[PDB]
Amino acid sequence: PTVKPPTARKFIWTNHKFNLSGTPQQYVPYSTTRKKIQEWVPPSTPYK
Amino acid sequence: GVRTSPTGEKVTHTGQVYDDGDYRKVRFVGRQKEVNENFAIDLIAEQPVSQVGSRVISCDGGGGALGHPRVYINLDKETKTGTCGYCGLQFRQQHH
Amino acid sequence: LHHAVIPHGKGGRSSVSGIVATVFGATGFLGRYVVNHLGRMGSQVIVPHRCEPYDTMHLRPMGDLGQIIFMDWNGRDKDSIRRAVEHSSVVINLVGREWETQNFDFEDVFVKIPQAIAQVSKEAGVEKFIHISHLNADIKSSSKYLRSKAVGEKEVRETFPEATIIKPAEIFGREDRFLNYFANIRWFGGVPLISLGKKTVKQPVYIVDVTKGIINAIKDPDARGKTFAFVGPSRYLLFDLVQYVFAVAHRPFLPYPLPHFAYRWIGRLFEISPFEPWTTRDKVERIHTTDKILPHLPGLEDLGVEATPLELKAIEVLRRHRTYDVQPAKTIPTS
Amino acid sequence: TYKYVNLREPSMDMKSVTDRAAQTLLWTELIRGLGMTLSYLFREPATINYPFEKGPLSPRFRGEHALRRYPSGEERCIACKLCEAVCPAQAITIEAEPRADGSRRTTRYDIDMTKCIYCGFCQEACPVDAIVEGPNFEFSTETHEELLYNKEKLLNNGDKWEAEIAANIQADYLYR
Amino acid sequence: TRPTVRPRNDVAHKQLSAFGEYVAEILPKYVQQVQVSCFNELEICIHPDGVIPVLTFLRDHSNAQFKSLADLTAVDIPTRQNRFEIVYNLLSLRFNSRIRVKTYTDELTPIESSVPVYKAANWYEREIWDMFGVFFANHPDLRRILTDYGFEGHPFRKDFPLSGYVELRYDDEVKRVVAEPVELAQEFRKFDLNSPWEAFPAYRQPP
Amino acid sequence: SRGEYVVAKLDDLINWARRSSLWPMTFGLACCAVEMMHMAAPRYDMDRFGVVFRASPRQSDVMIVAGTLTNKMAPALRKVYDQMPEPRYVVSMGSCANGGGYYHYSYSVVRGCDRIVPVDIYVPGCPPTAEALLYGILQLQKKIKREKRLRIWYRR
Amino acid sequence: ASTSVKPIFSRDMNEAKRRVRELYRAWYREVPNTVHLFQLDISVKQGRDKVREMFKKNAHITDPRVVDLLVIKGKMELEETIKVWKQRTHVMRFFHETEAPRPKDFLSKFYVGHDP
């Protein structure tokens, strides 16, 4: 890299992180899509 | 960019965040929620609108064969710009 | 409430049962069956553990991916308790030690810790709370184990009024210390007993029966604020029960009397070990204590569980004790 | 054409018979074997000093999957699901919707790294060089869940390794 | 020539066509159809009763000498009365040629075991019974070969689900591996890939 | 010297002894065993880290599940895990052992060896390179280095 | 010709029933050995009840060929048990000890889910 350094881009990490498995910084999977079915919310005022 | 919800949890670029009462927030206890800080929607909005002097322009995304399939964009409408369907770059026709 | 967790599926490993359970003390004998049953039906189980993570590895296969979450907690740290229960809908307290350590005595594990768990659960908004007492809990008993059970059972009933308290007899199973306890005495020549095992009646219950009672108490709305007594279907004298154990294990049985004060002297000697004592002065009191009869309390039959006789499954526990048919013991008819 | 491997006739003259008798009694051919193992003792071993030395790889190495961007920061993936359709193990799950600005983008991009066979068919089928198999092969985890990647993880890997992924692609795109 | 098209070999095609008639003339009792494909492969379609006569003739006759059983398998076509199609692939080292012999059966009709002719058929027929459920009569030792002990069903049938009906798991309560109904955290995604436009007019079936 | 200091040192000694003498039992079931054999080959020479090439099931400290685990084979894999003296760790090598892999949806395949035995390290790849497997073993050593059995015992 | 079907072993239901009883006798006498070799926790009575239950399911059959396959499969299943090709897990898969009882009535099925 001293002779042929990599192309610089703003989004590339400036600090490199080693393998984080087993530490509090570890990756945890989750769904990235929002809720599909919106449920009906009952009215908050008595019907009678 | 990343804007935290009223419970301390970051919202991803897809808008996903666990509601306050959701039990699935437990998986992050003692660990972290992986969120990418470089939102592509905001980054592509920082790119200047290229000014070109022809009705039709071509975009391959840059880099020749390392980009996206070359497409041709029409610039006859002066109210809006010509947006590439692949890379999001915007083009405008110079004063005509 | 906008909605509950809305169970989905067929009730298998990959299904969603809608139970989010924080099982305290899940790394013991009784806990390893609660997590197994909760995980078999697809339940999110949080397992706060005090031990090394190597000792929780037997729990990981019990649930699907992400259905078992392990957290650190300290019995004297309310903040760590809060982290483990603040997202659950049921909290199960299985914390208990059969001997006093240098740091935790019977007061801490049976009064302070259950009360701390019960209080934080109420503040956190937990709906269900299951507390495991002992059947022979009594504030006027020779066993400090049982006295602290009664004191702790009362504070849970006060801090968390809508708490289901389970009061089981001595539980027998593969990893128990009841039938495995009446098999390690052969290493010392004979089987010493108080009053030759006479005058003591015991009503042991099966581990799976206790496990199914806890599971059915979670899913039963008519179990909130109710105290259950889980007991077996038959009552045995402590002499004929121990005789049956040695008959299943095919080992010589030499029962001889031993005065109570002497049984305590040998019990004290075993308390010097820094590991799980073979027997302690408190254990001897419980073994010879007579299982109480509480007809006013509900039992397994109410929750929908048929108590399993000790005869159909004593071979399962005691198979490992053989070297290289048996007549059932004498039951006590109900008058 | 063919050749015989074991069709020789041992000569039965006195000298040849005594040569085989010396071989039987004096273990000549067994000592000849000890010579070969002795020679290897004095050769330089082929072992490398991992992790301080690493085995040689090539730009084509198929390692950890990753999602890339354009030089502007915009994601390359436009939710075409060709990687999902080609993936022989069905390891890719994709969902997409029109973004706020109207672009075609994914709202889910999961690769189950425990279903994946690291075949590389995804990076071949992608028309915008979005999903690639990077050069990292050291990402073993302590749990099964850590190998279920989502879009956030895959984008982070791209931002992490873009310096090396770009140079590998630059050195191999002319063979593709 | 054409760089991208497979060249044809009319000599082998003619030779195999003549040999197909040769077998059909010598075993009229069993041969039901003979065909040679465009890539010079000969198929002899026979009645299931002719398994031992036809194979024995092909193995022993001086002009055939098909002394090797390359492969023995089956195909499930549920639309036919006889679902299963038993395929014998034979090799002749004397004449450097191959022949394919096909018969048919159903779930309940057995076929005569070919072990008397080719000893190699012993394990191939165990696999057909195990995966397809075809029963071979007079097989010296017929039983499952590939599937687990006690496995119900015949996986390679077209109506058997891909993931099966049961799955294994270790249960800590019973201290053993158990079998339970199959639940999938992610269901296999069925892709409809067929194109609505005809691709090969040469195979257009008459309406 | 305080008790918390003696116990801290004894943990290091036993942790050092166990991670410096990891004898693996390899379940070579499918292709991933060939990459496991390449870790023993001169290029990487697992034996120089203290990891003996082949060890009997009653001498082994870690089981490497290298290859597809089918239903027919699952009972025999559990039978070998139960007979392994403790401490015992399990390493899942490759996608087939990890989560089913190419054959996830097969009627005869256990969708992950982690529903038959507990797993300590997951090594991804089809197959993981001999170097990627060596990274897992070295990652198991660091995991054993963080154990605090004696320290946790002293606080009971 | 439509019903002129080649037989497997039996030419009529009378012969097929003969093979079933012989198969049943073989299974009945094997259970006490199976419960001993495999160290099963069940009793001989429970094992023989399962053997009885398995035969009762296929009691409505009236096709000798179908009965021949059931006997053929039954003998194969018995062979695996006698020779100890099976293991304790395979012998205990006839009892479904870890599958929670599933409701059979309409109301109980109605509460849990959508399956009929």
Ligand SMILES: NC(=O)[C@@H]1CCCN([C@@H]2O[C@H](COP(=O)(O)OP(=O)(O)OC[C@H]3O[C@@H](n4cnc5c(N)ncnc54)[C@H](OP(=O)(O)O)[C@@H]3O)[C@@H](O)[C@H]2O)C1
């Ligand atoms: N076993 C029986 O016969 C009976 C009969 C009637 C009543 N009980 C009570 O049920 C609870 C479960 O006890 P157990 O599982 O049978 O036995 P243990 O192996 O001792 O389980 C104890 C678990 O709780 C943890 N634990 C103990 N002390 C502490 C402490 N100070 N801090 C945190 N946890 C503690 C323990 O964890 P670990 O030390 O093993 O890591 C176990 O997980 C019990 O109340 C019985 O009295 C059963």
Ligand code: SF4
């Ligand atoms: S490498 Fe192959 S199997 Fe893995 S995600 Fe890419 S296309 Fe799918």
Ligand code: SF4
């Ligand atoms: S990664 Fe590439 S192939 Fe896959 S959906 Fe995105 S653009 Fe299409």
Ligand code: SF4
């Ligand atoms: S993970 Fe890949 S290399 Fe390993 S057994 Fe499966 S297919 Fe073979």
Ligand SMILES: [Zn+2]
């Ligand atoms: Zn573009």
